[PDB]
Amino acid sequence: FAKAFAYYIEPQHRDVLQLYAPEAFNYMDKFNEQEINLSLEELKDQRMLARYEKWEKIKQHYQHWSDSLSEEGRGLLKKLQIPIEHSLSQEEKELLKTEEKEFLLSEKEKEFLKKLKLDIQPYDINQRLQDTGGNLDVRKQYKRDIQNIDALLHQSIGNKIYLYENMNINNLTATLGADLVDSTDNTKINRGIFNEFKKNFKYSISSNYMIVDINERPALDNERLKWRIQLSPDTRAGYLENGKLILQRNIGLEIKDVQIIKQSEKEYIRIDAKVVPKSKIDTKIQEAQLNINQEWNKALGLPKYTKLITFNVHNRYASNIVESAYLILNEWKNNIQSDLIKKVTNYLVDGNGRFVFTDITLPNIAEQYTHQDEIYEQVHSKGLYVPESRSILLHGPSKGVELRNDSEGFIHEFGHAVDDYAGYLLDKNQSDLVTNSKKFIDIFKEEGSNLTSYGRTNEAEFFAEAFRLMHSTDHAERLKVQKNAPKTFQFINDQIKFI
Amino acid sequence: PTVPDRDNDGIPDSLEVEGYTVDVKNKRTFLSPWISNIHEKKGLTKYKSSPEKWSTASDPYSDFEKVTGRIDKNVSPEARHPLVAAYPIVHVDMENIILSKNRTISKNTSTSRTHTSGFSNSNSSTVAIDHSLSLAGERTWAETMGLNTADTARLNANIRYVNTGTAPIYNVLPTTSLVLGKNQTLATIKAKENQLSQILAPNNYYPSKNLAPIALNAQDDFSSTPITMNYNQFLELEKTKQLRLDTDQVYGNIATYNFENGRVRVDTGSNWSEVLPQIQETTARIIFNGKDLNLVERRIAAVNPSDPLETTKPDMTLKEALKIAFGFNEPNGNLQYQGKDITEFDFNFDQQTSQNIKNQLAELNATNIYTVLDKIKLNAKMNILIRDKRFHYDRNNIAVGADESVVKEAHREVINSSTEGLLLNIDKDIRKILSGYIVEIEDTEGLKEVINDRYDMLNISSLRQDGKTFIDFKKYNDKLPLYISNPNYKVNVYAVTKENTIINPSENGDTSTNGIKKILIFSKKGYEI
Amino acid sequence: PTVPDRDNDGIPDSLEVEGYTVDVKNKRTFLSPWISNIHEKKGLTKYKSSPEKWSTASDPYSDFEKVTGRIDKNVSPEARHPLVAAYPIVHVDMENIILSKNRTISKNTSTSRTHTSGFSNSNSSTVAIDHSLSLAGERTWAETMGLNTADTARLNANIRYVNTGTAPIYNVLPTTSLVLGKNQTLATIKAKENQLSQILAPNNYYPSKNLAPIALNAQDDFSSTPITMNYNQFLELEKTKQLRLDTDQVYGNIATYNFENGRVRVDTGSNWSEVLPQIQETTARIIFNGKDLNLVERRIAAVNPSDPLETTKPDMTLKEALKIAFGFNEPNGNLQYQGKDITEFDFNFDQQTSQNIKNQLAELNATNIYTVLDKIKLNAKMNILIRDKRFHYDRNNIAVGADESVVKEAHREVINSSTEGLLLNIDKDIRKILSGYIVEIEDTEGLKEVINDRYDMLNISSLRQDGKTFIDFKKYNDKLPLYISNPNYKVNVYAVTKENTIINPSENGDTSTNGIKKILIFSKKGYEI
């Protein structure tokens, strides 16, 4: 390392260096360009006097407004920092006579629990703003409290101060978080999954109010992610008495680098981010959306102008999902019959459907609730084909409870959409899947439950699941259905024939 | 953000003072600072140069161009190093003469590049005519040509030009004057005009070996017999059989490198008769005969304390000079030229250098220069002559002899023997100090019969097309094989070194090889054949 | 934001090193990086070049201009490829002579460009004088011309110039000297002044085949008989019947391409006598006699390890070199020249080249060069000679003979036969190594009657205007048809190859074809005619 440093400084020798170790020159180039200020900040954080002095100085600025702060403000911040976790008296008690089960049938009684689940949720703000991306009576409280808390912090942050924040990997991707630590060594992380994480991780967005620590402190066991942020002078943030800050909502951050470092004999994950205007990155998002659409519009005969694709993802993990749409779409084509694609697309271009990729809950994403008959009838999951809206929903943030990867998750949803198209061709004025009901129910009796537990749910899920297995990229999965359901195979082969 | 480049020579300052080297990657050449460990495996030479001289050597080639190769691609390799002046060295080689009177003696001649002593920067050669009698009947030249006291003989010779330097001449061809004896100038060879349109690359001949050499007499009407020659001169020539060929340095124009398109065009502004003096006054001159016992001359730029600008040139130690001027290397740290260690050579110095050279060994407290060799600084204007110590030399530093013991050692490999001659395979160099052989037979009782008992009948050893020397007895015999009166009679063979040869009849015109100092070289009995 | 271009040759660096190609779209020409799939179907050649040479070949044409066509539209196609120097090669062809004394012997001559071995970059040719007796009574020239011991003959010949090189010469024409024997220089042909205002394009004659050849004797008053010749030469000539034509390298100026208006103007600054030396020291020289058994010379740029700048040029494998220089192609992956496989060819190497190439074959662990052809690196200064394996050759590397067995198949196609002669159709190439035919008749009892039983009477075969060879019996007969003493008598025909011919009467002046090695060709009984 030392040698490389020396060769880099000498101008006349600089060229020689870049010539024989190009990547190494690149490595040293990025270090001296914008990776040396980070060295100084991290070193000062070990000297107790320095950290204490830094903390004291920042406080001695914001003190004046803290005295000015109203009681209502403190009250809002209190219920914000700490979530707040006999009203029935009717039939619900007679009938009644994991976290929601502890706190608290296949008939009309399971609907009362869906409604109660919405009425029994804790009054919270940061998850709601992040979950929704920005009972009715509670909404009025939400609206007023959000408005009141919003009209508090007039103090923009406007030298560069660095802050620390520990976050649970399960908040970004709970599927990878289960295997991030080496099975044979819990202190090490497998580089193989790690390089994948970094692959398409270029920028990230925070939609809620981040509560961060001024000085780095030890993290919890499931928190191995130590975010640091280069603030902007205009960003409004709110200080707390316990050495924490509440950041403004709708903040944009650009990820410059992500690497593994070692501290106290255990490994952890560092993500370097810079505060940037969210509007500036959203402009980048629309261009990315246009590029994917324009490319795929010419692919399956689609009209060039039609969007057919909108990036609705809003979360801390948005950019890997965005880049992964290309991967998902490329797999979807390479894995499905060219003639099936043409057929389904004609059925969609004729209407006004869309492929909605989002990281917010389905009932609040874009239109799911607009096609629901009852508020309590809302459903949230990775996605499901909705005939009324003729739209495909793919929830990036969530992890499929069955599928092993995203390809399987999509193909599983691809079945429900396929059934709807078949129904459109057959009974024009009748339930798209009314013909498949009595046809699959019988098939589901003899051996329907034998397969995966997801398909055992109903004919629709079974049909959708069976289609995925029959068209899986792993011939083994396809073969399985042949030697395990020889009967089911022939009729299943016959609906996709219908052009 | 421009690196300081005072001499304006392409190369930046620091590199020039400290050391650099050019290396090619992928396919692009860039100039780089010397890395001790990473460049050596690649066999690149560590350069030095002057940050204040557009041409450290002062030759018409820039420091930069030389190492990169944008230069007349004809300059010999050894002259690419920045510290070796690249310039031409032309001397004249005369192949054979013929004589008659204004019965024609047409004899083949041999020439050698010369150097004599107070020796000055001017090239000269010396031809030596063979004395052996090719024809039986040609005793007394005065009669083979009907030359009378009041007659005049005509001389008709062939010459070729030799380039032993390191750079090409292009248009002009040098003027050269023949002179016999101390002051008898026989002729000056005219400078033919606009006729040497060919090229003289180093180690080449003009005209090449494949063509007839240039006939000296014009064959036109310029002079009826340009090479007249009075009687008295002919007498002088007969006693000495030596001529000399003096040539001046009026060479041609210079070939310069043009950056725009890489075309090499002869510039009419720069002319060699003005540049040579500069080189000649600011460099150390080393003459070496290691290769083939011929005088190879190289010039190295040395510092001169008295002149400011001149101190800019990198200090030059002798050992590296030999390394860089001729090709010596250190496989095991021991200086050698294809095996032969440095210790087998003499060092002779002109009177000036000697006082200076005695000083340097004193501040080092040493007596054997061969050890502390690597600590001797070279100054401007020294002249050094390095010749192999094993051979004897004449006044003109030409190889003329050697100690017999080496000579005998040189003969122990008899590839074949019969009654018609020997077919040896000897190292090509010895056969440059042997004029011929005298064969004799020794009776079991001490008699002595010399076959070729004439001063001019010793050149009996030819060389076969496989490099095998072949000695023919029937040559200066009676075209008859060799007879032996006794299988117990000894057969003696003697070799005669050049220095010990006779070129003219004695006082009383003795022609027998009696009073000739002969070295015994072979003696096998009649049955040992 | 500018693509780099160190050599200042239009093409950018990266493009030059990795591979490019010229293409035409609608009608505009653009440069493209080599695309593997889209270019091969278009029959485009994959070029490479030096990012550091204004002319990778080092000839006076830039890398860019060659491939782009902005170049003298006269350069032969094969020289359009960037790695083949396009330069002139002038040799002299003498068509026929006539002789007399200062009753005129007028003979037609045949010349061939020669090459012998230590062969150097200098052009020379070789004429061969017809030996057949046009006149019956013209036995012994010494008497046909009243030549006396004290007489002198006058020589007056006709010549034309042949350009076998690859680039045009424009104004000047080379001076050339006649020489008999080893050193008898008969004459040097003057350089006429300001008269060769015409052009010598490749494969052309000057003056063209449709005009009278340049008379050698001036016919003016400059010298009454410049080419005098004493008796003894004539004797030498009679015994040898061979002359030599040495030519020098003094060509003219160079034709350059002008960017402003596309005019090709003869620049008076650049002169070929300065470029060839560069070319001659940086290229590999290849001689091939494949086309018509004539010596074709081409030059390829090869690397020289010792020189940085020179390492810049793309590595050249022998196999590809031949591909681009002569027209070999790969129909079925087997190298061939219009059918003839590479295995029918010889490889000869100079001793220098041998060392390098023998090394090269060792690190590859191969013994047959014909296999590992694509793995031989070419270095600078190698000389390679590719000759047909089927023929016998003499000392001057001219095609002179072949194994007899091959010769017979060349005659197995009798298109017609009669009592007046044969009308054959033989491959045009064979008929330059056959001096003539011996016809003989065999009595039914084994006798042998040779019709033309004189050394100088074997030119009995002609060629018809349809390319059919025609043998005429009445020429050297008694102007009489062919008689046969027996319809059962065999008619024997013999062929005489050049190498085995006699050019002068023997010891006892034998004229019979007895001691001549004759090969039997066509034999047929009297009724099979």
Residue numbers in the entry:
A (entry chain J): 217 to 301, 309 to 320, 332 to 338, 368 to 397, 405 to 428, 433 to 773
B (entry chain F), C (entry chain G): 173 to 274, 287 to 301, 323 to 734
Sentences from the paper on this structure:
While PA8 can bind up to four factors, only three of them can simultaneously bind to PA7. Both enzymatic substrates bind to the upper rim of the PA oligomer via their N-terminal domains in a competitive manner.
We determined three structures of the fully-loaded heptameric anthrax lethal toxin complex, which differ in the position and conformations of the bound LFs. Binding of LF to a single PA protomer is mediated via the N-terminal domain of LF, orienting its bulky C-terminal domain such that the adjacent PA protomer is not accessible for binding. In the chain of LFs, the C-terminal domain of the anterior LF binds to the N-terminal domain of the following one, creating a directionality in the complex. Consequently, if two LFs are bound, three free PA binding sites are available, of which only two can potentially be occupied due to steric clashes. However, we only found that the N-terminal region of one LF (2LF) resides in the α-clamp, adopting the “open” conformation as described for PA8LF4.
